[PDB]
């Protein structure tokens, strides 16, 4: 039972993550929960070998001298994984997080026309948000696949590391892995503006300069897709402005008001009778809402979403009233009722 | 079929852009849509060679060590291209953006005397703005051509890369390509002050230091031309100030109030044709800027017709739906 | 009578601390009081040897060149100790603070459902606070044990040194000893985000960077547990913001308003706790910088299980008043 | 006549200080006045040798490379001295300041129960203040002796240099000489938090970092003792806050409001005898500190007699002219 | 036709500037207008040689590696030039700006007693300001000549490069060329305080440090003359403060309030001047940060010889209005 | 006519400064005015030799590589000078500023009992102020001489470079030259507090840390003497507070209110019928004035000086009404009348 077999098994079980940890049997995360594989405990020596054998010399050196490190690893014909290796009280440990391989279509995900409308906009900013493991990336991949299926455009991506690999259908697709194909988000973004892109994917909007450049890229007239870890349209908007220092808030607020096209905040819910399903809050950037943003009256937006049904807007709670246990629903509702 | 041939072909097809991307055949953008040329897929090795061949040694080094780079490239008798080279999951790639060569005249563009009046000012700051493809450089080129036709002055430009190439008529024209003729906007702007210029073009008022130097250059007594991607005179004025940290905002606001002469915010519309919002820097407006009451400026434009001011929406009242797509106030 | 024997003795006597100090016999702290063990005085040479013998070569070098140092030390089968070694007028000295090994359960500590509710939250920041000794680590250990007993999650900890050692029950538990299993809090925290953790214990809100990363980790969706030495929910909240320079305060304030789930400030014996729970109103208080009002907001939050330190104290009267915000 | 002999002689003469200065004979300060000992002038070479002989190699290096240094020195059976060595126009010089050895008791100093109550607090910050020669260390020594006599606690001190040497009675006493037993106040204070102390002495709340750490140490739950040269409870409280830059003032103010237990500001008067202003940290006063209304505190002291508070002027009402020389309000 | 001949010709034509630009014949600026000399176009190779030949090896290196550079150049018996060398689309280029050599007197410039009164002050700061070209150096040179004619003082100057060369009449005059006679403004200014100067010309208020030292020099008791490119007394005062970071603004404001004696803002031909004189009221305006009021304070300061730019302009009407603060 | 002769001549003429400057004859400053000595012009080569010959190798190197430098130079039996050497358009130049040798007594300077009273105070801060060349230092030297004549105290000085050299009479006098006997003002001041000093001279109060330490030294209970370039008691006080950043102003203001004993602001005036005489504004630190300082109402102080005659206070203008031409007087009066 080598690491290849273990990973293959994890994939067979539909696991998102495989954990090694000295003094424990291998464990896998499935639908959120980490559980032990029915195998013997792995002692430090074994865990250490399993890791050290895969590593290359640099990785070994990084790991050995810094005590921890990150890298990507591939099991030909099975999947790619992002690997983190580290030390803990019992010894070595690692986490192999599976990189999703096949891209799932909007139909496969049960995503309706509203997502297409949101994808279709000719320019601006679209944000897909939610905490870790909420599926944001998969939703994005579907939106990009849809565009790849329908427009003769250029999709350029900046990813750290690249997750989904798309194949060029109608769109030219160029994916750029940070640290390997480019030196950083900033460099790639400053380049993006010179790479004739209709559509630009920016993996995550935390470090300010990325955000500035992302906004510039949207204002300048591209279609920009970014992400955050926020749980509602409002919090998303607060988050984007709040992070900047006072002197810089007004322009960010204005840029955002002009460029923001939609916000999709998302969570996964244990599906009644097994598996999980996504629930989405959806906001669409209409003049009134743009004023709410521009005037700093976002507090009102939640109801504006409530009344935006005709465009396909919906609050998280609304969506939850449409598969899931009422209690599960209430666990995640803004207003438990 | 070398890169020269490919670009020639692209031009023959009226393409705006040529794309190379490892693992694909060459592709071209025509009337918006990217398409494949009927040729075999190009693999990394081939794309890489094609790019390597055009590059000079510095460009190769930049590209090789930084993993991406930008430069201008010329195909004698055909066109000049804005080039970016980069790497991606399948390997190497590059984008060739054609650069329009000839400078079109105010008349050819149907630009009236107001633009001449704006060009004519003896010193200060003039900003031409709008999204990409709004036609900012085009408007600027015409303004500079007009000056070239009429004044015995020195026009200095700093561009990344050089877009329109002017020929010295009455003006001495010196155009400086960033990364090739100079190390950066800042360096060229610091030198500008000692290069006896009357008129300076700065391609895009993006970096704080470029803006500081641009404002210095205008305050010091030259006529400075810059650009932004903003969509109205007000937003332009906010933005120039907004970008600076708190400690520095007041002086930028004051400098700007003193030096700003005009703002021309622009967009292209089908019939394409340009529409312009035009603001002219009168004492009242300068106070609006100085006192931080730019919110009032939009109406001040509305009432400045005598000087040739006009809001974007006003100009749009000279397809109705196309118009409304771009109007501040759809009506 | 070597240092191993001394420490064993200290444990046998239920001492929290063993002191060595040139010119004195060994001394131990028991229920608060430091007292001499009935042994001869130890002279500089002897104390120095006792310390020097335990130290490893780096520790010896640190100690010799910096004149003082800290390290952890273990007596197999007895306990682990937080050791500090230093110099004083009569010569060398050292202080061994024993480490509580056994995890105690919420029930063993008489901690009620409110702690479970606080533990249960799916993400955000929870702060357990109080002066030295006050029992923060213990309260945390119980909270983590409860999670370990109930959820199939990943608990990652970062500690300087590791205090309590948990055994993986339903949770996978990874404990990381600073300086040994990782180079620092920052490194481990930056790594944490990519070690698929549900729950993260940050042993020390050591520096601004640790706090930043802790907040990032909470905001990103994990459940983070941290500590401060503050004595009340309000002071805790102030302190988290106060420590940052002006330019950075607003964002920390905002991040905190969004992510903070609870604050538990504590003192010891039996533990008394102030408990605050992160409701919208309180989040506004934090966001708007009106935390001054929060103390009463705690007073009126009984339904959720909130309570002021003084309230809890109303469950010796004098001992109580020694530690009350409002002696009455 | 070596330096040992000289110091012995100084002690024999009841001198507080011995001065060496190249180009002069040794000199001693007695009852305030500096005088020459009946000996030949000492030239640079001689003074330098005399100093070199006492110094250890580090002290020599410090002195040689930094041109001046400080250290403690002991003459067995006579006294300990605070030493500073330095250079001046005529050459080398040094100052030997005698350090009083024995710790005097509260009773010997006529200090009443209030001082015990202040000493007794379980944690927080206590500040003893006044100009040089006011008797701050003396008061502190007595407070620590009292604790040494009564509690089974750990007293840790950090001193530059160690002034009074305590002997471990009920308390474990660890005294740390800066530059010799530790590298600095900050290092020793950072270690203190891990040296299981009940009570910590910090000789002079002068540097920001020392203050920050002192406040941390008090807030974290220890009883911290510090000193300043301020002359009243209010001024002391202002000063502790004043010294910090704006961004940091609020937290220092808050920390202090929570942790401050007492302030004892002191001066010596002929009859010498000590006079004390005494403040005790009650909720009302803590608010005064917290809200930044310390201006009111002086009267709050006036009305705090029941707890043993007293203004400097009040205490002075227990020569009338000598008294008035030192009164806040001469009357 | 070498560069010496070209420059000689430019001087013969009374040109302010000579331009070289690959692909063009030499061009000269005369009374504002740049025009071609009747000569063949100069190609890159030729322009490059012309420049390369004058340059020294460092200059060549600077130019070659940085792509552009600045230096001074002298044509014995003709003039000195401020040379800038650079690159452009057609190839090399360069700009030689002639240096006004001859000092002109206050009388020759029609400058009245007010300038003498301003020159005469025993210490403090005097600022002569205005856009490029406006005639600041000239106005200064006249002020210094007047002092040179009347006081037995020490005039020290620091310049990049030296423009006007004074001859020692009653004053000892020491002129220091930056990069050649001194390493920088800062160094020279720090030195100035110990070169026993009565009067100091700071050629460029180059950076914050220069300003600091200039202010120190004025405050310390010397008479300091400096320049800025601002267009009015108010803007000058604002600018001197604005340039500093927040923490430092107050002290600069205060120093300036105390030391500032006069501001002379100027434009060109004939010169027009705005003149402000440092009276207590104005000093308060500066100190209290109410400079906004100063413009009228100038209007009412005629008795001392103050005058707004617009006032002076009321001594072609259109030309006048081109440069008026208030066109009327 | 070598440099020694030149300097001797300058001293014979009572000059404060001798200037060399390529292309000019030697010039000397006497009573304020620089005038040419009746000698031939000195060309670059000669000036350069005159300077280079005196310099030591380090000084030559400093000078040669930094293009300018400073040092002290001594002409045995004549005087010491502070020398600055530099380059200018005509070539080399230098300034030899004579360091005053004999110390002048209060009587020799016509200073009355008020100065003694001010000197006599047991502790606190005394400031002697005035622009360059106003004689401040000489006044101080007289005050120190007086103390040296009368008290058995320790006078410690920190000077950059040491000007007047005092001889130990009743006081022990230790003078410390900055850069030579100590590394800096701060170091020496931190040492001073440990060197048993009754009286401490701090040469100049500009760089903040020196001021902080100076104030500490005064508050702690020594008698501190410092200087500034200000022209009146008020401006002196404003100057000391104004220089600090906002957060630090209050404590400086308070420290100063408690410690300040007197301020003596001074100027020299061309004496009618030849030479010059000093005029002084004198303020003495009484409780009322201390409140003015403490409460930040220094604006009132000028009149408080006017009414402080009994203690020997006087405004600059008052003193001017007591040797000098009325016009000369008005040149320097706060209120010309
Ligand atoms: N009371 C007085 N009457 C006449 N001349 C005096 C004088 N006091 C000083 N001088 C002369 O004035 C010159 C400067 O004196 P001093 O050096 O004491 O002033 P100062 O304290 O301003 C030095 P600095 O200019 O460096 O601040 C010297 O030539 C000195 O002899
Ligand atoms: Mg993802
Ligand atoms: Mg353009
Ligand atoms: Mg603990
Ligand atoms: Mg003491
Ligand atoms: Mg000039
Ligand atoms: Mg002096």
Curated annotation (Swiss-Prot), chains C, E:
Q: Which UniProt keywords apply?
A: ATP-binding, Cytoplasm, Fimbrium biogenesis, Nucleotide-binding, Transport
Q: Which Gene Ontology BP annotations are present?
A: pilus retraction; type IV pilus-dependent motility
Outcome following mutation: residue 281 to V: Loss of motility
What are the GO cellular component annotations? cytosol; type IV pilus
Q: Which domain of life is it from?
A: Bacteria
Q: What is its main location?
A: cytoplasm
GO MF annotation: an example: ATP binding
* CDD domains documented for this protein: PilT (cd01131)
Note whether Repressor occurs among the keywords: no
What NCBIfam families would the database entry show? pilT_fam (TIGR01420)
Family the UniProt entry places it in: Belongs to the GSP E family.
Q: Quaternary structure per UniProt?
A: Homohexamer. Interacts with PilU.
What protein does this entry describe? Type IV pilus retractation ATPase PilT
Which source organism does the UniProt entry give?
Pseudomonas aeruginosa (strain ATCC 15692 / DSM 22644 / CIP 104116 / JCM 14847 / LMG 12228 / 1C / PRS 101 / PAO1)
Give the lineage.
Bacteria, Pseudomonadati, Pseudomonadota, Gammaproteobacteria, Pseudomonadales
